[PDB]
Write a protein that binds this ligand. Structure first.
Ligand code: HEM
Ligand code: MYR
Ligand code: MYR
Ligand code: MYR
Ligand code: MYR
Ligand code: MYR
Length: 579
């Protein structure tokens, strides 16, 4: 009746206030902090109002309306936003769709920074509130499409950090490690959702639902197809809706989707019991990260319904897409251990098949050997996971990274050295954070991490194109992306680098540097070395890295550093060059 008083109630003034603020700071990305706060209090006062007397004037007004009605209050709306001010001329449904166009995705405001730990804690102290709010403000404006609720989620964590680290003795040592963790974590989520939306516009809905059908019926094996369909569909609207920038519709539909999933809890998953006990703002979040339920076991076989049984083509023809979804749902709920995209791949295959068979004399004998073709597809990833994990075992994380370094560098030598370093050590942590798991949960794992890394990689090659091959990959569908890379061969075109003493000239600094440092300086040298002599047999290289490993101990453990490095250095450089 007065949805605001309705939200204000289950949200709580705090949560209401911050949410309202972010919303205004993602639409009016230029107005000064103060002006927004005025708006926040302004809108809140009205909310408390409705909470008292629902019937009060305007309280019946829809949220988009209330919003777009207050958006059209700012006077410097035409001065500041110029064209956008026109929007106010339209009626709700259009007025809002209008504001959304003017949302500067990547605007031009100064980077952010990180004041002195001491200035911070002081700020955080004198005025707890305005301090946190301002930053919240700064961020939101720099990321107009970031999901509001989730931002608020980070918010409270921050607040914890400060009320925790600003009291200890060693401040910078209690806070800095967390501030860094909130950053990287925040940048993952930012990258994460931007990719999701990137997929939605490029390959569209159809594709998008396929992904959603797979993943969901993977997380909810016991739900009926009709049930998973609904979710997938509802779910698709939501994404489309946030990606557009509609904090509101996004927030509501998400709100509903969770209410629906929690009322029908027993009809979907047993892993939801906890999630649904939690408060409004926290359910959605809890559910999207829920563990997979466990499969029925008394499940039939796929062969029956999709390969043997005639009239297969008849079914497919009545509703080609509904049928494939069924195929997908079925195959998927039996394989938590598969990767969403692997499943998609098969799904793709099966589809292709049918089109090339249902128009034949005897179809039933045409597509009977389907399940065999899936074998190559399924084996391919599994090998790479087996092959690559074992190798990660023998060699510690660090040692395994070098391996990849030596691997990929030989693949794309043209890339920047520091680049390769980063893309590798990152690939290393994957093999660790994943292989530590049992089979069933490996691919899924690999896939979840690998997708961002491989993406992070594309963000860099695009900014500094060096090779087409890597570009070719980064542009192909999301399904092929990964395969496209595993398909890269050693570069025989490349013409080795010319020796550069200083490149291999190591002084005594690495001795007192933190492991992370030593490792980097070391790894850099390696990459370089492989750029100098690409035809280096796996053997040769180790040989080299070993003398070096020791070389480093023999010098930092000597009484005369710098002299040991300079003297013993020409010796390693020679013997090496000798191979
Ligand atoms: C309620 C408070 C806060 C929230 C919700 C928040 C949220 C975020 C998010 C989502 C990002 C990553 C987005 C991106 O760069 O692409 C980020 C980055 C960052 N945040 Fe915060 N933050 C808060 C407070 C602070 C505070 C108090 C500081 C410093 C005193 C800070 C410093 C930074 C820095 C340095 C980055 C990285 C910026 C860059 O990459 O150039 N944040 N934050
Ligand atoms: C109309 C909504 C239907 C949702 C179910 C998707 C059906 C799967 C068709 C095959 C998807 C191929 C995906 C791809 O190769 O990009
Ligand atoms: C203001 C509306 C906030 C809606 C929160 C719903 C949710 O995303 O869980
Ligand atoms: C796993 C799928 C769980 C379904 C719950 C959907 C909530 C997340 C909606 C994405 C919106 C951002
Ligand atoms: C190291 C991990 C090996 C890469 C395998 C990733 C499987 C993901 C996929 O389905 O393409
Ligand atoms: C540009 C540098 C090349 C990066 C290639 C990374 C490919 C990772 C896929 C994992 C694999 O299959 O080995």
């Amino acid at each position: 009746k007065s949805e605001v008083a309705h939200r204000f109630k289950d949200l709580g003034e705090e949560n209401f206030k911050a949410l309202v603020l972010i919303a205004f700071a993602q639409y009016l990305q230029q107005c000064p902090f103060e002006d927004h706060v005025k708006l926040v209090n302004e809108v809140t006062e009205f909310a408390k109002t409705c909470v008292a007397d629902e019937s009060a004037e305007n309280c019946d007004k829809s949220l988009h309306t209330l919003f777009g009605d207050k958006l059209c209050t700012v006077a410097t709306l035409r001065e500041t936003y110029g064209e956008m001010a026109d929007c106010c001329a339209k009626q709700e449904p259009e007025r809002n769709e209008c504001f959304l166009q003017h949302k500067d995705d990547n605007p031009n405001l100064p980077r952010l920074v990180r004041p002195e730990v001491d200035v911070m804690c002081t700020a955080f102290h004198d005025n707890e509130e305005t301090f946190l709010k301002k930053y919240l403000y700064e961020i939101a404006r720099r990321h107009p499409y970031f999901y509001a609720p989730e931002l608020l989620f980070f918010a409270k964590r921050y607040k914890a950090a400060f009320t925790e680290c600003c009291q200890a003795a060693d401040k910078a040592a209690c806070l800095l490690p967390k501030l860094d963790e909130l950053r990287d974590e925040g940048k993952a989520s930012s990258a994460k959702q931007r990719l999701k939306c990137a997929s939605l516009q490029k390959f569209g809905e159809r594709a998008f639902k396929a992904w959603a059908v797979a993943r969901l019926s993977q997380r909810f094996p016991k739900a009926e197809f009709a049930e998973v369909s609904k979710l997938v569909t509802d779910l698709t609207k939501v994404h489309t809706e946030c990606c557009h920038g509609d904090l509101l519709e996004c927030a509501d539909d998400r709100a509903d989707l969770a209410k629906y999933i929690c009322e029908n809890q027993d009809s979907i998953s047993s892993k939801l019991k906890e999630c649904c006990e939690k408060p409004l703002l926290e359910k959605s979040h809890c559910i999207a990260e829920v563990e997979n339920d466990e499969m029925p076991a008394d499940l039939p076989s796929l062969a029956a319904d999709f390969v043997e049984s005639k009239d297969v083509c008849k079914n497919y023809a009545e509703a080609k897409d509904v049928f494939l979804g069924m195929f997908l749902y079925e195959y998927a709920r039996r394989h938590p251990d598969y990767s969403v995209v692997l499943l998609l791949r098969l799904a793709k295959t099966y589809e292709t098949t049918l089109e090339k068979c249902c128009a034949a004399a005897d179809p039933h004998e045409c597509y009977a050997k389907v399940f065999d073709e899936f074998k190559p597809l399924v084996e391919e990833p599994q090998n790479l996971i087996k092959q690559n994990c074992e190798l990660f075992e023998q060699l510690g994380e660090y040692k395994f990274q070098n391996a990849l370094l030596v691997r990929y560098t030989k693949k794309v030598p043209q890339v920047s050295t520091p680049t390769l370093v980063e893309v590798s050590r990152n690939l290393g942590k994957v093999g660790s954070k994943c292989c530590k798991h049992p089979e069933a949960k490996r691919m899924p794992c690999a896939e979840d991490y690998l997708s961002v890394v491989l993406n992070q990689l594309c963000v860099l090659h695009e900014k500094t194109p060096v090779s087409d091959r890597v570009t070719k990959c980064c542009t192909e569908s999301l399904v092929n992306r990964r395969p496209c890379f595993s398909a890269l061969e050693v570069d025989e075109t490349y013409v080795p680098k010319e020796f550069n003493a200083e490149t291999f000239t190591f002084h005594a600094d690495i001795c007192t540097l933190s492991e992370k440092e030593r490792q980097i300086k070391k790894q850099t040298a390696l990459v370089e070395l492989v750029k100098h002599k690409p035809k280096a047999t796996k053997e040769q290289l180790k040989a080299v890295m070993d003398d070096f490993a020791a070389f480093v101990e023999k010098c930092c453990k000597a009484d005369d550093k710098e002299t040991c490095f300079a003297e013993e250095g020409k010796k390693l450089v020679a013997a090496s060059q000798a191979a």
